[PDB]
Write a protein that binds this ligand. Structure first.
Ligand code: PRO
Ligand code: PRO
Ligand code: PRO
Ligand code: PRO
Ligand code: PRO
Ligand code: PRO
Ligand code: PRO
Ligand code: PRO
Ligand code: PRO
Ligand code: PRO
Lengths: 274, 277, 275, 272, 267
């Protein structure tokens, strides 16, 4: 199997870092192309052993699975450039937020019939092999292509198939999720610093607390409210802190965030289709 | 130290999580663990019973059984325990208090009445030790030999992060990583509600939000970059993420988490001043 | 067994009505006294068959179990009024919010030693036999007294023993709780009316919704968050309504309420201990 | 002799099947449930015949509950519309879905379908549901009476005009979730003031149940019952004040309104 | 004079109770009809709307606003020259009513009014507008009949939706305020029964003061508040919550909804 990346941004580096750390891909079996060959991420890939080239056509010719790791508004221009170079062996995997399978297939179909397209939403934690990935299969993605992509993406985190009409909501939850967590961890650390902890120790403790709680939930058959109840001793410090969260509408803010991200994702695609 | 006996006074959530973590790490055999509780009809008690942990209603037997003795009872019960088993403390014992707010000097004062130089360690840990990803800090008491702290850190590092701190930091650690898991559980419930509002099935929404949090936290622990920089790397210009971050800022999301750490730390200090009275 | 009520107000009527509906006591075996024999509760008690008298001493002499259903600050004047009339057979059951076992025992002990005192916190839904009652036992309240107490009060709702130091918080939750629900049901009916429902129907539907939800939780081994998860279909009407509750800090308001009730209960006793 | 079927085996189908069996109005073997992916070990232990095929449930049943997500109703109706017989009563439990849209789809197969629309809720599982129904064009006077007797066995039930069901959805349909949220928060409050969690949850739920039963059995306004519990200067009126200061009442009006408005939106999307 | 009511809800009961208490009409000269079947007063009843029409000279339409067009088409052919039709329905225009009734007989005599429930204690607040064929004697007879149970004055029809938001919905604003003022009295230690009576008397007394005064309500507010005193402290916490803006919001919200409802009726 030969994997290629169109784009050499953060997600291209993240996935190639995870894939090779997982030992599922030899770094030299991965080719990446960038329009800005002086990127910080392009220099990192060259050290890993990832083959590099400025021409997207080189990436198409050298790969079987083809990740589109470009900005959403760049997808149509990439598809126009490489469309005549797609062969029957290709699986085209768009990672762009919002961009639909139908729009990709329509562009590629003008060149050759029956493009094999898969759409996915992943996130940056694939770089430490703890990503969250969903994918949906296009019209001509044979039953094997989805299972192949799930095997590949499972090596860097959780991965499952969804209906495509859920991917915008997933984007608002696990696609944007890490940024919510980085904000929360920065603020939790400021809280620790306010109460007298050194900054380095506060970041470590807050981050370990979030990782541990999330692992607990994933490994538990209990509701998050039940796990919350087990932390909060009657009259104790935790339930006092939980109350001030509630007084600020903490829960509503995170609902607001998933909603706003999902709505914007739909808007960006409506702008694309217009 | 695979011949050491560990005892828990208290058989609640913290005793169970530490006992599960320790045996899951395979650093202690479950039958080498004894726990004592005044209420035996607790769910955690039946759990400990099935693990193979020895259960007893008498704190004295836990003391005679143990080398390391965790005090995993509610903070205001600690002085009652110290009076009960203080005459049973022997030279071999290391007493590890897990009670929020209770000071090393308050423990050493009660125990020194019975026999001098009690070996006392105060720690603050959290429930994720049950999946070996806890966050533990400890402070060493007056007669806690350098070897006792090193033993303590070796033991608690088997179930997550562990480091020594000065004792005057522990109340603030309590508000951050002690209470921290409940902030995350609340956030994960809410994020899952957000996914459900936007059309996702609950089970999938819970899993995605939890995986997102775990992945982000691991990224930061493995990164040499500021969390603000990692946040910047996620936010595409004009995109969905920066739109979501704006609505969090408009609600004072950052300030609420600062409020929580402060409120928990302050309450922890209050609990000790009520005991001190 | 003969039961007495010092005070003939809402709580005495509620308990007496539930007891006689449960069939654990005949109405003629209940005596109630009140400093004001013109209340609507007194007229309802008379029609029920309850004996009514203006003299608290008559109630003490009639009864085996003696409930103190007066306002909290009236208790010290009651205990001084009838302390010398307390006999060995009496179990004194204080229903007054805040008033501690120690304060009652201290005033009664000046007359005869070893008064049998129970402190309880109940609520008005005992009148339909669905109350929430907790009780704590005094120093001389033998094991049979609490067991008898729990048997009597279990006939009109949930009843369990607690440590006394929990009762002020219970007062904030189940003691004041019915008022929180009456407010909620008034508001839910207003929302139904805003959206086009007749008032009478909106009140019936909202009350039925709250009753069934509460019974579901009581009969389930599942967390209330899981039950909430079960009713909220993805993208649906319920999760949209829950969002607007969260945006107003709905959860925090109810936490505020239990806290404020409990704190006030503590303040009231501190003022009494000062007097 | 009446046979009941369920197209969908979700929360609502399980809840109605559980309440109906607890009520003894239906033997569990007279109940069939169908789902694309299945609660399977639950209903089989309960005695409910299960099957993956919707046509089997139609062929087995006299009364046919449609307990699928609202946007799945058109695909169900087109799948089994040709299997509907004269004996069938079709009871839609989907939120927002109109009688006229069900009758329109079914009338393409056979004239005069007997359609009833209802809005019920999950406490039917403990036989304390709140149910309203509206009768369709060809639902004879007998069908609404039969539906009301069946659903009255698992809680409150009454006929309404169909134009009220979206509002009912926002009140008693979504209501239980408002209650579970409140009970979780009331228990947090008890825990903050020192109660064990288990006991706090029990006391809060009992208080809610008792208050609701009081109102249902009382000839008085809920504000009068609220007055009767708040003694002057006491703990309750202090607690009521902090609820008023947060706009507690307005939040519950907001919820009923938001649920009703969404229910209308869900149908306007299906009609489009 | 013969007075009839179509609809038998709160408004019909309020007006009938006020009219008889005022002594302008004997109860037996009044007839009310309703589909959902006052009798103790002596007011004749019937389920048929045509009977009320054939009995009455003045015909009050106290039905819900969305039922008015159904009533007009039901009784339109029985409207006769002697009839004055008085619509109490919120929002419903004189022109919509006259258009309905003119398809049966020309020049219907139509009056539109906005009253409120305190007519039952003869302290209502009523405004009315006269239709195209309401001879000037019909407005005078209307103001005469309605002044016996409260304030009554003629207005241009385009003000009635605003009036509805002020004095039509206003009693509900007051009942909410009186319930809350009572909760305040109870919080501060008063018995509930006494707190209700004191708050209501305070509100009644201040309203009457303003009505019998030539002074601005701010001037009367100044006369109550002594410097540094309890009242001015209380007014501050009202201002801090934006109390004034809430009542403006209420009048506006009610007026706007009244217009929405009529716009839905027109379409
Ligand atoms: O997700 C989608 O839309 C397509 C349809 C069936 C499988 N994948
Ligand atoms: O709630 C409390 O008081 C303890 C301290 C941190 C975890 N739980
Ligand atoms: O932090 C404390 O209190 C002691 C002093 C040095 C080590 N541990
Ligand atoms: O911000 C955006 O548009 C994408 C969505 C998840 C991460 N970046
Ligand atoms: O709770 C109390 O005050 C006492 C102590 C043991 C039984 N009742
Ligand atoms: O959320 C919804 O759309 C439906 C309405 C009541 C229960 N669930
Ligand atoms: O409620 C409805 O819309 C129809 C009309 C009469 C009976 N059911
Ligand atoms: O209002 C009070 O003070 C008492 C305590 C709970 C019920 N009523
Ligand atoms: O107020 C109106 O609309 C009409 C015009 C003059 C008299 N009545
Ligand atoms: O302002 C004051 O202090 C007095 C009290 C009632 C009226 N004015």
């Amino acid at each position: 199997m030969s994997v290629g990346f169109i784009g050499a941004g953060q997600l291209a580096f993240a996935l190639a870092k995870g894939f090779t750390a997982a030992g599922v891909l030899a770094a030299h079996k991965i080719m990446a192309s960038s329009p800005d060959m002086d990127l910080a991420t392009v220099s990192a890939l060259r050290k890993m052993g990832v083959k590099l080239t400025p021409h997207n056509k080189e990436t198409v010719q050298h790969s079987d699975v083809l990740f589109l790791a470009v900005k959403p508004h760049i997808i149509p221009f990439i598809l126009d450039e490489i469309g005549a170079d797609i062969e029957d062996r290709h699986i085209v995997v768009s990672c762009a937020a919002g961009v639909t399978i139908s729009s990709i297939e329509k562009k590629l179909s003008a060149f050759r019939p029956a493009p094999r397209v898969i759409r996915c939403m992943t996130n940056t934690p694939v770089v430490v092999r703890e990503g969250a990935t969903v994918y949906a299969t296009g019209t001509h993605a044979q039953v094997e292509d989805g299972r192949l992509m799930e095997q590949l993406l499972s090596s860097v985190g959780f991965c499952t198939e969804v209906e495509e009409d859920l991917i915008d909501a997933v984007t608002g939850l696990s696609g944007s999720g890490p940024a919510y967590a980085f904000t929360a961890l920065d603020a939790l650390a400021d809280g620790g610093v306010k109460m007298g902890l050194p900054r380095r120790l506060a970041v470590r403790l807050g981050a370990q607390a979030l990782l541990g709680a999330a692992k607990m939930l994933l490994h538990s058959e209990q509701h998050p409210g039940q796990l919350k109840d087990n932390v909060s001793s009657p009259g104790g410090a935790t339930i006092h802190a939980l109350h001030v969260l509630e007084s600020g509408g903490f829960r509503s803010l995170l609902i607001n965030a998933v909603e706003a991200s999902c709505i914007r994702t739909r808007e960006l695609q409506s702008m694309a289709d217009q």
